[PDB]
XYZ file of C-alpha atoms in Angstrom:
481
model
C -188.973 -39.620 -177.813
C -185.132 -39.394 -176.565
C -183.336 -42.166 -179.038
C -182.165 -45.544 -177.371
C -178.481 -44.668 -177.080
C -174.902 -46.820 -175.784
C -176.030 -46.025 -171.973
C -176.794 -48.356 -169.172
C -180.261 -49.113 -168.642
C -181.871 -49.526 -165.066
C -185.142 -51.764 -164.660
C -187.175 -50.240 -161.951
C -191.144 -50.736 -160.760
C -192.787 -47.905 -161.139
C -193.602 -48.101 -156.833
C -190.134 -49.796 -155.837
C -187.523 -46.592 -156.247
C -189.747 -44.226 -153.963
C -193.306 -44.354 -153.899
C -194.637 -43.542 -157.289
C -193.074 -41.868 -160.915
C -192.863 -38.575 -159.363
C -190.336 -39.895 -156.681
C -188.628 -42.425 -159.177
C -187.785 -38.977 -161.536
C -186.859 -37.574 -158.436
C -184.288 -40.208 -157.551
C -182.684 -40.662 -160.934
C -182.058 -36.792 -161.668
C -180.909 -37.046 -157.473
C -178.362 -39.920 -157.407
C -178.627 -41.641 -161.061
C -178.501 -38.171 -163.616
C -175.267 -39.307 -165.401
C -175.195 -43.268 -164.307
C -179.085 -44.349 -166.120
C -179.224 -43.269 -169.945
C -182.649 -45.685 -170.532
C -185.549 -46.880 -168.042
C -186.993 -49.883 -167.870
C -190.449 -49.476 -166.357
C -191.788 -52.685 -165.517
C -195.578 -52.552 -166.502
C -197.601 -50.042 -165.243
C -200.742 -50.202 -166.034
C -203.369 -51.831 -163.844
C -202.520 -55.248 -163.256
C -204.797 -58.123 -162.194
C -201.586 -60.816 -161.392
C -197.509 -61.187 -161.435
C -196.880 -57.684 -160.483
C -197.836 -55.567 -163.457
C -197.669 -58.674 -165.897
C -201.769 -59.602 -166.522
C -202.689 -55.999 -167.778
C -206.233 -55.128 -167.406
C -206.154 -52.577 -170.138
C -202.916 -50.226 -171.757
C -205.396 -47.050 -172.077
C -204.040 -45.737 -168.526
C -201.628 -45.410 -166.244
C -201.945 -47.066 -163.181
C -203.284 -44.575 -160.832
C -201.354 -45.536 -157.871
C -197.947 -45.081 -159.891
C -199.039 -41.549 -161.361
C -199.948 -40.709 -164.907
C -199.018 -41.101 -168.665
C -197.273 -37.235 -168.199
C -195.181 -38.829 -165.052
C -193.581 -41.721 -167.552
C -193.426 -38.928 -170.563
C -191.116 -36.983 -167.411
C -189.030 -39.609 -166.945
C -188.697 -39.931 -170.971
C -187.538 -36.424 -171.953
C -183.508 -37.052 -171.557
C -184.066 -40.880 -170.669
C -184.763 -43.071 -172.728
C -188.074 -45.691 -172.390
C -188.448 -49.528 -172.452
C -191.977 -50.487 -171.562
C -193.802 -53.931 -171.597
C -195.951 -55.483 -174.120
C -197.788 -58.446 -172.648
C -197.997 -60.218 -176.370
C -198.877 -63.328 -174.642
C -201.600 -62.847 -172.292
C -204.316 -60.075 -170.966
C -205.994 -59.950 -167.570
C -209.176 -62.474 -166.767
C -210.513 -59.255 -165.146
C -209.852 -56.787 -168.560
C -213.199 -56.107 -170.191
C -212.029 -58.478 -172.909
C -212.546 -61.266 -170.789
C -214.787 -60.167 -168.707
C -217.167 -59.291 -172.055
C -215.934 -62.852 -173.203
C -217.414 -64.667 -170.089
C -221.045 -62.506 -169.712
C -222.063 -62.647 -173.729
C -219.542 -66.193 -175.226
C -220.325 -65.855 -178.613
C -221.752 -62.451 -178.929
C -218.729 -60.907 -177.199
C -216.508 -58.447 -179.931
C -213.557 -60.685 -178.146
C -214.979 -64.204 -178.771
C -211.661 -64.927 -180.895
C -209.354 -63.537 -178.394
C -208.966 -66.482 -175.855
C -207.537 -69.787 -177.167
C -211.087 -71.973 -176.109
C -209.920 -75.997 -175.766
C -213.080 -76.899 -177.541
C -212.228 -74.954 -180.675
C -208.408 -75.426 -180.658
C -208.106 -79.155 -180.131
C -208.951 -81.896 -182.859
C -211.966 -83.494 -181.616
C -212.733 -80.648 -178.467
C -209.749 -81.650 -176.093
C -206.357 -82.220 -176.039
C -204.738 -86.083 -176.049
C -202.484 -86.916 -172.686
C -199.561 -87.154 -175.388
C -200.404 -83.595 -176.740
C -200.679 -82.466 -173.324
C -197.598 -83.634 -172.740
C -195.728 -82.128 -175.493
C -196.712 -78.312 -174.351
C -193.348 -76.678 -172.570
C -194.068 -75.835 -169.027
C -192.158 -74.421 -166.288
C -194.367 -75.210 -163.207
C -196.722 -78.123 -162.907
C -199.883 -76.543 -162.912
C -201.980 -77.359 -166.472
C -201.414 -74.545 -168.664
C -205.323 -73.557 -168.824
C -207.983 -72.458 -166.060
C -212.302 -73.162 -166.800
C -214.012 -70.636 -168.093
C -217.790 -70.316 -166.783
C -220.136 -68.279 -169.079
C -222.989 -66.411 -167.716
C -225.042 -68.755 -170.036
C -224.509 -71.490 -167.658
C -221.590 -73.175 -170.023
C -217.998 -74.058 -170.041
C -214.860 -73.981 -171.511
C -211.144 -74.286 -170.660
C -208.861 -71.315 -172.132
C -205.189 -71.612 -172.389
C -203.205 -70.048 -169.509
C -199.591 -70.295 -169.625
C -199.001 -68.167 -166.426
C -200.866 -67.209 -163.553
C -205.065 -68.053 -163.070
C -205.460 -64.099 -163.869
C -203.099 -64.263 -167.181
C -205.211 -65.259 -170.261
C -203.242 -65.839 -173.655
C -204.698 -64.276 -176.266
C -205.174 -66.315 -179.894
C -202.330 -64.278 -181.840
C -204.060 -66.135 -185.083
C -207.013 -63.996 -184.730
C -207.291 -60.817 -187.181
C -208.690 -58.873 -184.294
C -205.859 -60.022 -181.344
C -203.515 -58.968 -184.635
C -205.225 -55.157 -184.805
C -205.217 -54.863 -180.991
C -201.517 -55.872 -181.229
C -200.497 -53.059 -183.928
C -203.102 -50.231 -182.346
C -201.658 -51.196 -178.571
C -197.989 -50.790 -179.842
C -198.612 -47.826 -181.684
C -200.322 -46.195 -178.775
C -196.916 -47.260 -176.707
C -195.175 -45.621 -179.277
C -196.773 -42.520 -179.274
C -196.120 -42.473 -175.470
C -192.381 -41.987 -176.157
C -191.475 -46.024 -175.685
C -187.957 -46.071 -177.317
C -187.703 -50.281 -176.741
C -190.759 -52.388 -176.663
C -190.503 -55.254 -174.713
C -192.063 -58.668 -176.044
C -192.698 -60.486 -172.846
C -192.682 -64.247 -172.953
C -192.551 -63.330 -176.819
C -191.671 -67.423 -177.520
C -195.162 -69.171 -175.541
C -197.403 -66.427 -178.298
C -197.807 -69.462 -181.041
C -199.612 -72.755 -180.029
C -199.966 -75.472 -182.165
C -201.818 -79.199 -181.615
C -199.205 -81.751 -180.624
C -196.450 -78.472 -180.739
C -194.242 -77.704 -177.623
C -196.276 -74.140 -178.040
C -192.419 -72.699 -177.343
C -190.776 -70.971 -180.365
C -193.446 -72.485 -182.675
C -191.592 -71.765 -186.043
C -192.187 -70.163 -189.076
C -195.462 -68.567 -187.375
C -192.873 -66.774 -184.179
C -190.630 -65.445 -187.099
C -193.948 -64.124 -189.167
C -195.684 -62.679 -185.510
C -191.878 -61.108 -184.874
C -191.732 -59.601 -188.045
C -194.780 -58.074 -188.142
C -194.421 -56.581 -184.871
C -190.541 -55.269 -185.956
C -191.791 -53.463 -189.158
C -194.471 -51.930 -187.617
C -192.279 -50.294 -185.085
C -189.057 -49.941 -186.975
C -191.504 -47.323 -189.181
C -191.750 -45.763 -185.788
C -188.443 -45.361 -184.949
C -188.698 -47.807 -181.927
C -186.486 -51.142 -181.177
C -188.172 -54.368 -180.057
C -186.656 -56.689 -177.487
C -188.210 -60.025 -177.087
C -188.079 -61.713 -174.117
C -187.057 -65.853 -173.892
C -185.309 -67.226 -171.594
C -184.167 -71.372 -172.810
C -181.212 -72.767 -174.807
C -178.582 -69.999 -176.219
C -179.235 -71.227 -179.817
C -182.612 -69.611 -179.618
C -181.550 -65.990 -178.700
C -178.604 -66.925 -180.756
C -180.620 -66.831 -183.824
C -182.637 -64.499 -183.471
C -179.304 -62.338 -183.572
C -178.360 -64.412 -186.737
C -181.571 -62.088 -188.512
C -180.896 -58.481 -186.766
C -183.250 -58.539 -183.541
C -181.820 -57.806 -180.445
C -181.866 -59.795 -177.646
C -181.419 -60.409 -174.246
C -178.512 -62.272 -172.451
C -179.968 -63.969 -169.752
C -176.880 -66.543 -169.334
C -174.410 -64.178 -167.748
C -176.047 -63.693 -164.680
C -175.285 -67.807 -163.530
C -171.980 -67.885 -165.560
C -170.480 -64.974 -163.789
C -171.299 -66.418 -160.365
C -169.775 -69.581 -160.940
C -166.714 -67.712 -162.870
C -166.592 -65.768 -159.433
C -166.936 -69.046 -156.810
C -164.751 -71.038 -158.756
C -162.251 -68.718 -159.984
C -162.999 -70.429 -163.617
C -162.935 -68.019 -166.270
C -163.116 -70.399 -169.611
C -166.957 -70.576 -169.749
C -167.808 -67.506 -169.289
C -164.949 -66.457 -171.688
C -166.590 -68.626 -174.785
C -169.273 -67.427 -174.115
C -168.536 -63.909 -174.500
C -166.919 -64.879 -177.573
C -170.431 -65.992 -179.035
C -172.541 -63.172 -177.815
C -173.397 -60.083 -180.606
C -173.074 -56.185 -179.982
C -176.340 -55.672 -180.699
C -177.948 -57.500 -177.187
C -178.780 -56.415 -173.461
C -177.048 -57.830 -170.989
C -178.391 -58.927 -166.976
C -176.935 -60.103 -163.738
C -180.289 -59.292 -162.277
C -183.657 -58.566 -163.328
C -187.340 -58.527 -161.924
C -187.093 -62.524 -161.616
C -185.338 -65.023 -160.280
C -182.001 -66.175 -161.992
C -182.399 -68.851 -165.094
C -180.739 -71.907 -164.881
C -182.270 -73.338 -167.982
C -180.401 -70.237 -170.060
C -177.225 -71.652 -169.179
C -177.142 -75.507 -170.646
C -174.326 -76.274 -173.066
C -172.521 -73.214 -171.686
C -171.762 -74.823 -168.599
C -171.229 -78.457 -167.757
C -174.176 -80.143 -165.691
C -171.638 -80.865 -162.835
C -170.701 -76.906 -162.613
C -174.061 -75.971 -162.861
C -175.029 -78.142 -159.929
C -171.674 -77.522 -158.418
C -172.393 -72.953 -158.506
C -176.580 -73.669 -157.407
C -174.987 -76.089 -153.963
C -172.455 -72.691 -153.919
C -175.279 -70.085 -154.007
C -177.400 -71.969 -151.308
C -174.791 -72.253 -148.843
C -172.337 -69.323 -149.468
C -174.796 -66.700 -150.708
C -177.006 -64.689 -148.221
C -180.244 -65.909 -146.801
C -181.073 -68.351 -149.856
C -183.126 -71.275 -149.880
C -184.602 -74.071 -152.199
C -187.974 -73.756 -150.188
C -188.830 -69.794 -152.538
C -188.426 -71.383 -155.703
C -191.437 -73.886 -154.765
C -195.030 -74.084 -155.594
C -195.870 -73.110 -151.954
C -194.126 -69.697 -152.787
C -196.185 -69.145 -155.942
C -193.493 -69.206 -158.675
C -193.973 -69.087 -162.505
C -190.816 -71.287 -163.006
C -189.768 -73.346 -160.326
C -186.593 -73.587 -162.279
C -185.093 -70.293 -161.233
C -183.257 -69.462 -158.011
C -184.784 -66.358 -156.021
C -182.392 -64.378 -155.058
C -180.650 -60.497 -155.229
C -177.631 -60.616 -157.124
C -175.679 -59.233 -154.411
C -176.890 -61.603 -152.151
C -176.239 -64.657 -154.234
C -172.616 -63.171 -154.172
C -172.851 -63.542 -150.167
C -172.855 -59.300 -150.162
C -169.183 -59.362 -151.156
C -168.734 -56.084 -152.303
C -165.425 -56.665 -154.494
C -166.981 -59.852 -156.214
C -170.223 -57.632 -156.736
C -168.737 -55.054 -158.410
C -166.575 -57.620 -160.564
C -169.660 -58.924 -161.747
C -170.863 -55.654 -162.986
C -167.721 -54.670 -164.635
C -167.662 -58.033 -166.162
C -170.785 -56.868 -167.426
C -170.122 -53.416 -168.446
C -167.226 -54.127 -170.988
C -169.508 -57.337 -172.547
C -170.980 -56.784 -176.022
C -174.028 -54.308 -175.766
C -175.587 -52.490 -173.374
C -176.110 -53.409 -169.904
C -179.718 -53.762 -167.426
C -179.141 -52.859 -164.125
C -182.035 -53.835 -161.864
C -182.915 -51.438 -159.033
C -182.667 -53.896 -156.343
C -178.807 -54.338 -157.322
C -178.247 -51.035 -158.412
C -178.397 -50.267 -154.420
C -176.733 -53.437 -154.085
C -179.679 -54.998 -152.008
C -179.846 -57.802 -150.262
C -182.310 -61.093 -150.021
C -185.711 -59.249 -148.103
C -187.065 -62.028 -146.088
C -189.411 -59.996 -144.679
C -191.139 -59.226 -148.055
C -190.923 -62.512 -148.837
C -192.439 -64.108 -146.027
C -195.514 -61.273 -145.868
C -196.443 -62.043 -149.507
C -195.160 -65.789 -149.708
C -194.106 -64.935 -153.494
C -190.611 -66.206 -153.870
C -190.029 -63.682 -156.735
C -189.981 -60.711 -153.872
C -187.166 -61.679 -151.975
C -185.211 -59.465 -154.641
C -188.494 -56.775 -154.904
C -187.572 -54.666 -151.826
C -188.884 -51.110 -152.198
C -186.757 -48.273 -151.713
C -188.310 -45.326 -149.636
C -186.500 -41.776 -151.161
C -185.233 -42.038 -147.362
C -183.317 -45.563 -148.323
C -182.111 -44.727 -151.514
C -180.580 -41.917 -150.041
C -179.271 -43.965 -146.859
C -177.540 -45.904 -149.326
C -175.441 -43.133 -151.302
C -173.029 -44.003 -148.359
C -171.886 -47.438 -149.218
C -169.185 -47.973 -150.977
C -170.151 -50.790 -153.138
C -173.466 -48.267 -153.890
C -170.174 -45.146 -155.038
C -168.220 -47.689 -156.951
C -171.050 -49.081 -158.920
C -172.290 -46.046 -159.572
C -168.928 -45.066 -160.835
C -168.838 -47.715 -163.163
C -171.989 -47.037 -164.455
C -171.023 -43.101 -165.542
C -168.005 -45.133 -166.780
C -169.932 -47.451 -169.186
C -171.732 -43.651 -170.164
C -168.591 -41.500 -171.173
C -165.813 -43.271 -172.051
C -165.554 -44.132 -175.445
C -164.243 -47.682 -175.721
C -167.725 -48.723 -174.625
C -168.842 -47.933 -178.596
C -171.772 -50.474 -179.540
C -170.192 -51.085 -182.529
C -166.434 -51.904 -180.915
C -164.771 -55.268 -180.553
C -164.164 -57.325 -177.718
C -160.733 -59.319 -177.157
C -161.225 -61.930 -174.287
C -158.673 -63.834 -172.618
C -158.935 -66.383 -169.939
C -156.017 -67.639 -168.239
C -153.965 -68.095 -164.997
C -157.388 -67.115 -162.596
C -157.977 -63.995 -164.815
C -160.158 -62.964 -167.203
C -158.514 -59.882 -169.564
C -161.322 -57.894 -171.506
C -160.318 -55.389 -174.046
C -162.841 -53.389 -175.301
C -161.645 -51.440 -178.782
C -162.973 -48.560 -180.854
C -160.542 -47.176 -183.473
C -157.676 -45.554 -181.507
C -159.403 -46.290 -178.207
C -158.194 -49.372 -176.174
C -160.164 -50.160 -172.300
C -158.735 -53.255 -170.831
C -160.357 -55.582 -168.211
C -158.811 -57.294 -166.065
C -160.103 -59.534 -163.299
C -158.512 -61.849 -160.793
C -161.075 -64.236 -160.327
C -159.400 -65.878 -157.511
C -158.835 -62.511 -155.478
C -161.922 -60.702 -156.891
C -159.964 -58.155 -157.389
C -160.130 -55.880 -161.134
C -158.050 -53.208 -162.703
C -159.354 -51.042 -165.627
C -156.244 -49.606 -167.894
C -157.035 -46.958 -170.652
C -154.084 -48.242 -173.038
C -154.359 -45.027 -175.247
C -154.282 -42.538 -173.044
C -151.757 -44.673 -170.753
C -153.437 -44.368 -167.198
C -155.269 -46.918 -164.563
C -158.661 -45.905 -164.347
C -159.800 -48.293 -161.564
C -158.846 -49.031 -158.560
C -159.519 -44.852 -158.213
């Protein structure tokens, strides 16, 4: 296992950066050797739903993508984040599929949350079904029909194919610690809790951060894998103050409310939001502009006023390229209709300078940045995907032939970013452990990155979208080169 390190980290399907792992080693040691430190693999097992996310099993590779030797390939001077669906399992995994033939008599009869069993008197009051958090308005369950002629209704926060498992059952528990350990024996540097805060459902609870049991479930899952040397990274995306504490006790986190503030920073030429924020944000996180979903909107309340908020989403559907309200709706099978499908570049309207401002915003803010594939080529909004799957979501999925990735080593924007990127990797300011001095004033927003002797300054005119980068020790402009 290569140790998670202070390098940028690039989320990538296993099938969008050419065709399979082979190709996607190919095109990092190609184009990316010095630029991507850490991998991302979105999940890559077989997958009954959501693109990788309703795992049929973790015991193989899916075969399409390659094998367990083609990720190990990619892990020997890369470091590995993979997926750990905590949440939820496929309805077509043997679990479930045992489940529904023998009820009862299945070895994963506690593994499904069952409404009968769960609910004080066999179903759920409206007011209790109104209390559950939900970010589409589908009911969070499906019916389960057993071959005895029966039936049930199982809790399903997600998709019809994504069954949560009952994390209060001793034998979900041992499948959690033997599934991780098997991850970690696979070289996984960073383990990946998705949707870490729906695992704990209580009666009459929001079933959303469901404390002290999340804390106890997060802590068991830490300990076992600190003893292996390997991080975990849970993913939530709501209010700051959750992430926020979960900082506050030594996990790392993600920073999911960049991506919006640094597009309206960048329409508006407003840098005092995004500033405080900064100010708030620990070393020890992972920042995004993009990632495999659509952009939260929820992530940023009480970091920027209701009226900007509205103000940068009216900005994004009529300035940014080939956006619209319609892929965020049920008809285009979204998760959360409360995200805004779009590439990064695109929601930028493909300006290169205002692009690349974003990701140096990002690259001198605490920790260590994602960059997602799709804006790592700076891609735009793919309609055409889109409109063939009718999954909002894919509009920013495009996959890259070898052939494109290549055809876009020519771009400018593509140089540049990649620049900054084997920036973030050598120079020494960039220390994990450093401090950040922010200043927003006058259209700009000055970043100062320290590390003993070392001194990186950032600074951006938000108005012009224009950024130099000074090296104050050594006395030299690094950027524009």
């Amino acid at each position: 296992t290569k140790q998670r390190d202070n390098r940028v980290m690039l989320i990538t399907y296993a099938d969008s950066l050419g065709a399979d792992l082979k190709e996607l080693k190919t095109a990092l040691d190609t184009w990316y050797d010095k630029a991507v430190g850490g991998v991302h693999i979105l999940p890559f097992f077989p997958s009954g739903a959501d693109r990788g996310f309703s795992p049929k099993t973790y015991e193989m590779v899916d075969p399409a993508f390659g094998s367990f030797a083609d990720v190990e390939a990619i892990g020997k001077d890369r470091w590995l984040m993979f997926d750990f669906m905590v949440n939820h399992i496929s309805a077509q995994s043997e679990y479930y599929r045992d489940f529904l033939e023998k009820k009862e008599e299945s070895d994963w009869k506690d593994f499904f949350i069952r409404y009968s069993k769960f609910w004080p008197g066999g179903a759920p009051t409206q007011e209790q079904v109104d209390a559950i958090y939900k970010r589409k308005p589908r009911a969070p369950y499906i019916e389960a029909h057993f071959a005895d002629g029966t039936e049930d209704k199982v809790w399903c926060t997600f998709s019809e194919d994504q069954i949560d498992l009952d994390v209060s059952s001793p034998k979900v528990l041992e499948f959690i610690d033997r599934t991780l350990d098997d991850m970690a024996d696979h070289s996984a540097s960073v383990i990946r809790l998705d949707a870490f805060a729906y695992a704990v459902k209580k009666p009459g609870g929001s079933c959303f951060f469901e404390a002290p049991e999340i804390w106890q479930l997060l802590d068991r899952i830490e300990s076992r894998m600190q003893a292996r040397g390997v991080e975990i990274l849970p993913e939530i995306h709501e209010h700051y103050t959750i992430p926020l504490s979960l900082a506050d006790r030594g996990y790392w986190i993600y920073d999911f409310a960049l991506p919006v503030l640094t597009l309206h920073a960048l329409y508006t030429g407003n840098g005092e939001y995004l500033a405080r924020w900064l100010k708030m944000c620990p070393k020890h996180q992972y920042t995004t502009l993009d990632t495999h979903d659509g952009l939260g909107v929820v992530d940023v309340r009480d970091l920027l006023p209701q009226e900007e908020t509205d103000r940068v989403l009216d900005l994004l559907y009529e300035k940014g390229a080939n956006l619209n309200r319609k892929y965020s709706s049920e008809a285009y099978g979204n998760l959360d209709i409360y995200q805004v499908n779009t590439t990064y570049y695109s929601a930028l309207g493909n300006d290169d300078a205002r692009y690349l401002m974003a990701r140096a915003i990002q690259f001198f803010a605490p920790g260590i940045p994602q960059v997602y594939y799709v804006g790592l080529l700076a891609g735009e909004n793919d309609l055409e995907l889109l409109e063939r799957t009718r999954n909002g979501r894919d509009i920013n999925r495009h996959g890259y032939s070898l052939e494109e990735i290549e055809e876009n080593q020519k771009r400018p924007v593509v140089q540049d970013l990649k620049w900054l990127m084997e920036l973030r990797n050598s120079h020494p300011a960039f220390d994990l452990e450093g401090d950040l001095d922010v200043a927003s004033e006058d259209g700009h927003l000055r970043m100062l990155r320290r590390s003993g002797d070392e001194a990186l300054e950032l600074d951006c005119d938000l108005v012009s979208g224009r950024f130099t980068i000074e090296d104050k020790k050594r006395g030299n402009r690094l950027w524009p080169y």
